[PDB]
Amino acid sequence: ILRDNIQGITKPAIRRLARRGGVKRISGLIYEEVRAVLKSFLESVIRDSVTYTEHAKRKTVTSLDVVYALKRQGRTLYGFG
Amino acid sequence: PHRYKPGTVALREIRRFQKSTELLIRKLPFQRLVREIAQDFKTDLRFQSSAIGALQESVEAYLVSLFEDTNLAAIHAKRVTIQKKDIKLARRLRGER
Amino acid sequence: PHRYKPGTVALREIRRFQKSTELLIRKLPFQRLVREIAQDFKTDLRFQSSAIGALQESVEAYLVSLFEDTNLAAIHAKRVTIQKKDIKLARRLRGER
Amino acid sequence: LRSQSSSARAGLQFPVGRIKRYLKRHATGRTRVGSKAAIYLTAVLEYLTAEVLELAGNAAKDLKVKRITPRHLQLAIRGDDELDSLIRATIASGGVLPHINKALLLKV
Amino acid sequence: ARKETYSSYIYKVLKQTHPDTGISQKSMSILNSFVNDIFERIATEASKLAAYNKKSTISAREIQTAVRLILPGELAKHAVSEGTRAVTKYSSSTQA
Amino acid sequence: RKETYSSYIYKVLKQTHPDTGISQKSMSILNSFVNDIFERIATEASKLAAYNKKSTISAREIQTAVRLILPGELAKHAVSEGTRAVTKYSSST
Amino acid sequence: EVARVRNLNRIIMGKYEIEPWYFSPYPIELTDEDFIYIDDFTLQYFGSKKQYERYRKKCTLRHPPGNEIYRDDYVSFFEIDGRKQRTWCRNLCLLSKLFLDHKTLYYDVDPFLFYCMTRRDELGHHLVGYFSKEKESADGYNVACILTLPQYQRMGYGKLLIEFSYELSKKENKVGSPEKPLSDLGLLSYRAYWSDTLITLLVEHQKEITIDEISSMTSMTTTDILHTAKTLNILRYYKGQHIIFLNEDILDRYNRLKAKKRRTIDPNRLIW
């Protein structure tokens, strides 16, 4: 099945995910702009993800190719495959 | 039922998570997230588990970087909450796009 | 006598730099200073002159990037001048060591 | 009328011997097709144009006839379409765009 | 006393896009530095992804991929339109 | 090709203190940095010996590569044993 | 070769002659009648004339039946609950495929709750505006095209139906688009649509605000705002959605906000 639903309503995970670094008391309204910044970052990594896949000419995705893309956007999340 | 002052309990939960290194966002939530952002601009394609795991690894690392230096920008203004103008000043100092 | 506010040098000097893109820093003292910092690692170096032009507008570009970000980081915090915490937060967000 | 493949066998305007040379000077392995590669002439044509057309844009804005460098930096910061193509944009004696902020003016 | 130069084709294409203007020497050097470094990064990642695909010869599909992944979307749709159009033109290599 | 470095990583970790163990998953991290800073010193060595248009790549350009990217302290003791081991190949005939 | 032939007789709504637009897969009985005599009340059709008075002796329904959402001082606004109101969707869809080319009854046309727009007098309603959507997020597509009775166009019914859709975009905060290919009056009308929202988008500030905000209060983002910037004549703005500027222009039709732009609807509506 393939139907569009809204996973932009991700989860309120940032009230533990901003609990990864030294976020003090939070005071909110960050949910929509943390939503905006992570949607920008995921769309940035996913369009060159699928770009190598059409240069891969097979309709899966993979990890060595995702780290190829991930360093070519500069934000090289190093070390997984 | 005795529970004393809030706020330094924020500090022990601070040290509680950053001792640990568990992958902090939830799995099938990012699964449906990355499918339903990928399927639209380019058509129906398939994923692999290690690749998607690594790409939310990228998502975590990038956004934890941006909120820690957002915290530094917030405490510039002598203030302890987190508010939006800190966030967009952080995004702008970080090289707008 | 005609006189108008100390602190209202702002907009006329804004246009007064902004129309022209000529190189701000005065040349041969800047030659002397780059010669002096270079002179204490390795001997007998010369400069080519357009190399001096290159490193001159390199320091011009990097300085205008610096205090453009300290300008809006100063206005980040309801402040009218730049001060030392502003440049220190710039040198937090620089990312280059 | 002429028996000479006159180097624009697509009809473009950049030197293709230079393109064969630049492809065999990036030159990693050993066999690299220099015949197909006019599809990179077309990209260096497209952004010849994607700078010189906004050269022609700001050519009116300064009332010149001779194109120069500060107008080149105002065109290098035409827009977000072309900031990002040259992420570090600083060209020599380029100056900066005119910008006051909304902060300092308060009718004082 | 012998140097490859870029400026010639540059000024003829400048005069054909826009008819009636003039150029300048340091502005000539800034746009020829621009054209060779944009070639530089397309070439580097072209060799890089024709390396990591485990395929042996550089190809037009490979560099259409390359130009898609390096430049943003507005000039992506431009550059792919005249990529296909240029290969339509030089592919059409007939007697007439 | 199927080809890694992790065995030579393991021999290195043994010619440390041999008391520890290579972990299950950090050897992928070790593989990824050894090949990526391998590849990037290869890139810069390529074009830095290409700017003088000299055909091979050899000693002078490699020690200038492995000084001109990596920062100060580990660079200079790195190039110290660089000269050491390259003489130590030539130490015999 | 088959599905676009002008097949019917003509349209004669009571005493008012309207010639058609295009095909629909007819029972040829309606072509065999020389009329399309529609009903002035609830819009039904059959194979005779003097059975147009069995409802005239039977009439207890004289408007579309379901949820009348709004009437202003001028016209009523409406939604058909057409899951099991396929019966009103009957004469909706037959009139539509008299006048709506691009989709076809190859599926059956249930799956949205269709938006209608009439006007009662004391004698009752008359359909003066209509179209549909689907549920959500097909291709964006807030702006969906027009239906109107064929005799009171060229004055602003399309303006009123699109501001209807604009408010219900505002109370859904969802961003969409017009139809992709074309609509006949729809092109220059939609130029007018973003034009008058554009004059209400550059007048109210006197300064310059960021452009996602002016992509906000009319809910048309970066696929519309570019031809707002360029297809009124040329408004050179240092292109970029980081900021562009706005400037003084002729403002001449802004100096005529008195004719055919004099009335609108306050946001008083129900949601879904």
Side-chain angles (χ1 to χ4, degrees):
Chain A
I1 51 95
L2 192 277
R3 59 101 171 178
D4 185 76
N5 47 0
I6 176 66
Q7 278 79 12
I9 309 298
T10 68
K11 191 259 196 182
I14 194 70
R15 75 272 298 270
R16 74 277 310 140
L17 261 288
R19 275 84 160 184
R20 192 266 201 269
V23 170
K24 266 74 67 178
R25 58 103 63 228
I26 296 95
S27 75
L29 282 76
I30 46 93
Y31 296 94
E32 65 277 24
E33 59 262 17
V34 74
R35 199 63 55 82
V37 298
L38 104 159
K39 70 171 68 68
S40 66
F41 186 76
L42 57 84
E43 69 190 0
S44 68
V45 300
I46 288 301
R47 93 277 308 278
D48 64 357
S49 80
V50 304
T51 303
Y52 62 69
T53 67
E54 68 244 5
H55 194 274
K57 290 88 183 171
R58 74 268 191 180
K59 61 177 71 66
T60 60
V61 85
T62 185
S63 300
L64 268 301
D65 288 334
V66 82
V67 76
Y68 286 144
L70 255 61
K71 89 260 209 175
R72 74 91 44 235
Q73 75 247 6
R75 278 82 58 91
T76 162
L77 180 123
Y78 156 81
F80 195 75
Chain B
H2 187 273
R3 184 263 177 202
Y4 56 89
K5 177 73 186 68
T8 185
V9 290
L11 193 274
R12 103 263 174 261
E13 58 86 21
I14 283 286
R15 304 301 190 189
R16 174 256 192 184
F17 53 76
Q18 70 236 10
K19 176 66 170 65
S20 175
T21 316
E22 198 272 330
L23 194 68
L24 227 290
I25 34 98
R26 183 46 189 68
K27 266 72 64 178
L28 295 174
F30 64 74
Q31 173 62 255
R32 58 180 69 94
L33 186 272
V34 300
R35 300 284 183 180
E36 295 289 327
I37 61 98
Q39 89 293 27
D40 50 358
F41 74 102
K42 201 264 183 297
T43 182
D44 49 353
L45 267 72
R46 306 281 75 77
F47 288 160
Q48 192 273 331
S49 70
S50 68
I52 52 95
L55 69 90
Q56 92 263 357
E57 284 176 352
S58 70
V59 172
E60 291 125 11
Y62 185 75
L63 104 158
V64 299
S65 63
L66 72 88
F67 62 70
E68 287 120 14
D69 60 358
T70 306
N71 296 318
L72 204 284
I75 63 100
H76 175 215
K78 281 82 65 178
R79 190 259 305 159
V80 77
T81 70
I82 287 93
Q83 57 90 26
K84 184 260 289 182
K85 181 252 292 179
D86 305 326
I87 282 96
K88 64 180 181 289
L89 192 271
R91 185 87 277 278
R92 197 179 184 276
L93 59 83
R94 282 289 91 197
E96 174 71 27
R97 285 295 182 270
Chain C
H2 183 74
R3 179 80 283 286
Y4 183 59
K5 179 69 181 178
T8 57
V9 77
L11 192 275
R12 84 283 302 136
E13 86 188 3
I14 280 282
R15 185 75 268 172
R16 199 260 305 172
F17 58 82
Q18 189 57 45
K19 191 262 181 182
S20 185
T21 68
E22 54 91 19
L23 59 95
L24 45 83
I25 206 64
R26 195 265 163 290
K27 283 85 69 179
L28 66 87
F30 183 69
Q31 177 265 326
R32 295 197 306 271
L33 65 91
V34 300
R35 173 75 82 185
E36 287 174 359
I37 50 91
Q39 78 188 359
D40 289 333
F41 297 90
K42 190 261 290 181
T43 177
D44 69 3
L45 53 94
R46 54 95 77 91
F47 55 86
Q48 197 275 334
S49 179
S50 67
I52 292 301
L55 55 90
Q56 192 269 328
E57 71 241 6
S58 78
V59 307
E60 193 272 331
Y62 188 54
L63 286 175
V64 297
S65 66
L66 256 61
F67 35 72
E68 77 202 2
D69 80 13
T70 71
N71 194 0
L72 93 153
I75 75 168
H76 169 82
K78 70 180 70 64
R79 188 62 187 83
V80 312
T81 186
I82 38 93
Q83 48 83 27
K84 181 164 176 281
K85 198 180 190 299
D86 291 330
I87 52 94
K88 284 183 183 295
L89 75 96
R91 306 303 300 161
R92 184 264 313 159
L93 66 96
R94 90 289 188 266
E96 53 93 23
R97 180 73 269 170
Chain D
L1 294 174
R2 292 183 291 113
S3 66
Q4 184 68 40
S5 175
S6 65
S7 73
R9 80 281 299 154
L12 305 179
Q13 286 79 13
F14 283 0
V16 309
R18 300 282 174 87
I19 83 98
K20 178 62 175 66
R21 279 188 178 86
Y22 60 48
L23 67 90
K24 92 262 194 182
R25 81 174 70 102
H26 77 276
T28 299
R30 74 277 313 146
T31 298
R32 300 298 176 272
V33 177
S35 71
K36 64 101 192 174
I39 23 81
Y40 188 58
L41 270 93
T42 186
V44 287
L45 259 77
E46 168 55 32
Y47 58 119
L48 84 88
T49 60
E51 61 272 22
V52 304
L53 96 158
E54 73 264 23
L55 266 72
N58 60 2
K61 274 79 172 177
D62 54 354
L63 282 310
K64 66 176 192 70
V65 80
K66 297 193 289 186
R67 67 99 167 98
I68 33 102
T69 56
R71 58 179 309 282
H72 276 176
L73 188 135
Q74 286 106 33
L75 72 91
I77 298 97
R78 280 299 94 187
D80 57 353
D81 55 352
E82 51 90 28
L83 265 299
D84 51 357
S85 57
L86 54 153
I87 292 287
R88 192 269 177 205
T90 297
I91 58 102
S93 67
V96 287
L97 65 100
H99 200 277
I100 53 98
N101 56 4
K102 78 279 193 185
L104 87 162
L105 72 160
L106 73 160
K107 194 183 287 185
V108 64
Chain E
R2 173 64 268 147
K3 181 60 179 67
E4 193 276 336
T5 317
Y6 285 172
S7 66
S8 66
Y9 61 83
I10 292 172
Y11 71 83
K12 77 175 190 292
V13 298
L14 186 272
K15 83 183 192 298
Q16 66 87 24
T17 52
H18 175 80
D20 45 355
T21 180
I23 52 96
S24 71
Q25 280 68 232
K26 52 183 65 61
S27 61
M28 294 304 292
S29 180
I30 68 167
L31 95 161
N32 67 20
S33 64
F34 181 70
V35 299
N36 62 15
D37 71 356
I38 57 95
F39 162 67
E40 183 64 33
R41 83 272 316 277
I42 68 96
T44 53
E45 49 83 21
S47 66
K48 189 257 185 294
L49 71 98
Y52 68 70
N53 58 2
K54 272 74 178 175
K55 190 262 189 183
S56 297
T57 314
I58 50 100
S59 67
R61 190 180 193 175
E62 190 269 324
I63 76 103
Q64 288 295 323
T65 300
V67 71
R68 281 188 289 109
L69 56 92
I70 60 101
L71 42 80
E74 58 288 6
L75 62 159
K77 69 179 180 64
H78 285 293
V80 299
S81 66
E82 50 263 6
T84 59
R85 194 174 68 247
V87 73
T88 305
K89 293 188 293 292
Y90 77 85
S91 65
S92 63
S93 297
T94 61
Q95 292 85 17
Chain F
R1 187 180 177 181
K2 170 184 87 270
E3 174 66 32
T4 176
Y5 301 101
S6 296
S7 66
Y8 299 102
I9 271 89
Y10 178 67
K11 266 86 77 176
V12 162
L13 188 274
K14 293 287 103 177
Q15 63 89 31
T16 68
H17 45 79
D19 52 354
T20 61
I22 57 165
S23 68
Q24 318 183 354
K25 187 166 85 273
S26 304
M27 88 280 280
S28 67
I29 283 93
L30 302 191
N31 193 1
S32 51
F33 80 96
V34 297
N35 65 0
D36 72 4
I37 68 177
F38 173 76
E39 281 119 16
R40 76 166 181 264
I41 66 170
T43 58
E44 90 244 0
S46 70
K47 93 273 290 177
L48 76 90
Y51 292 135
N52 57 0
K53 277 77 62 181
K54 185 254 193 67
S55 76
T56 179
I57 55 97
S58 68
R60 202 175 194 271
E61 52 270 20
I62 55 88
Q63 67 238 4
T64 61
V66 304
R67 64 161 171 75
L68 105 168
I69 59 99
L70 51 147
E73 182 65 30
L74 83 155
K76 90 267 288 178
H77 59 75
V79 299
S80 72
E81 57 258 0
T83 60
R84 190 265 312 158
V86 73
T87 53
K88 191 263 302 172
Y89 184 81
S90 65
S91 64
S92 71
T93 60
Chain G
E1 64 182 1
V2 175
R4 292 297 299 268
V5 292
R6 185 257 173 275
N7 193 8
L8 72 158
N9 41 14
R10 47 94 173 265
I11 288 94
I12 172 65
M13 61 99 71
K15 278 75 65 179
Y16 292 165
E17 175 65 32
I18 290 94
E19 287 294 326
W21 192 53
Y22 89 115
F23 186 72
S24 83
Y26 285 155
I28 318 296
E29 196 274 325
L30 59 91
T31 301
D32 197 2
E33 307 297 326
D34 195 74
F35 52 87
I36 300 299
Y37 291 149
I38 50 95
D39 299 343
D40 204 6
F41 287 161
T42 45
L43 280 296
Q44 289 81 15
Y45 185 74
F46 48 82
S48 67
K49 170 62 182 175
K50 291 286 102 179
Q51 294 296 319
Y52 285 105
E53 285 80 5
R54 59 95 178 171
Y55 63 83
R56 278 190 171 98
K57 69 176 72 66
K58 190 71 173 175
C59 182
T60 78
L61 187 61
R62 56 114 194 95
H63 65 85
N67 194 1
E68 296 81 14
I69 184 174
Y70 184 53
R71 182 167 179 173
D72 54 359
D73 56 353
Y74 187 65
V75 284
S76 67
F77 299 89
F78 190 81
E79 62 273 20
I80 280 292
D81 51 357
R83 296 290 80 81
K84 269 70 181 172
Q85 190 56 260
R86 187 71 260 262
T87 62
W88 194 270
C89 184
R90 293 272 89 81
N91 62 14
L92 287 176
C93 72
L94 66 88
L95 190 276
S96 78
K97 299 301 164 187
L98 293 176
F99 282 158
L100 275 64
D101 48 358
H102 286 162
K103 64 273 193 183
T104 311
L105 193 63
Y106 65 96
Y107 62 95
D108 199 357
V109 288
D110 186 81
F112 186 68
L113 303 173
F114 292 161
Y115 70 93
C116 169
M117 202 277 282
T118 68
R119 179 196 298 112
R120 55 95 65 209
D121 57 359
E122 178 66 25
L123 203 279
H125 289 275
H126 301 91
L127 175 272
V128 293
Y130 174 81
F131 199 58
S132 168
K133 273 88 68 177
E134 197 60 31
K135 299 300 289 183
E136 62 181 1
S137 296
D139 286 327
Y141 191 73
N142 287 128
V143 173
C145 82
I146 189 69
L147 270 304
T148 304
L149 48 75
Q151 65 272 16
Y152 202 69
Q153 281 77 11
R154 81 273 303 150
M155 59 83 59
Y157 277 170
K159 307 296 294 181
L160 206 64
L161 193 62
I162 60 138
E163 58 85 28
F164 167 78
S165 69
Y166 286 169
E167 282 112 16
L168 289 180
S169 68
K170 289 191 289 183
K171 266 63 68 189
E172 77 183 3
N173 68 22
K174 178 257 184 181
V175 170
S177 69
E179 290 184 353
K180 182 260 290 181
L182 190 145
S183 178
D184 47 358
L185 190 272
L187 299 175
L188 75 160
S189 74
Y190 187 70
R191 308 284 76 72
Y193 294 169
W194 57 260
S195 81
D196 69 344
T197 65
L198 198 279
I199 57 95
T200 63
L201 252 56
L202 91 155
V203 162
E204 78 280 16
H205 196 186
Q206 283 78 233
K207 297 280 102 174
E208 179 66 33
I209 206 66
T210 58
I211 305 304
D212 192 76
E213 281 81 6
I214 68 100
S215 301
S216 294
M217 78 281 290
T218 55
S219 179
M220 51 97 207
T221 321
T222 61
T223 189
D224 196 2
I225 63 175
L226 272 73
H227 55 261
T228 71
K230 69 180 71 175
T231 55
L232 39 83
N233 296 116
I234 179 64
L235 265 302
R236 179 83 280 280
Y237 278 171
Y238 69 98
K239 55 183 179 181
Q241 287 79 20
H242 55 91
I243 193 66
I244 48 95
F245 79 108
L246 291 166
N247 46 5
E248 177 64 28
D249 201 77
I250 188 162
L251 278 306
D252 50 351
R253 189 57 175 82
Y254 166 65
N255 297 317
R256 274 96 67 189
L257 260 287
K258 270 74 67 178
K260 299 291 180 68
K261 301 293 187 290
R262 78 275 189 191
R263 51 96 52 229
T264 181
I265 280 94
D266 52 355
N268 46 14
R269 297 300 94 220
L270 60 92
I271 50 95
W272 297 270

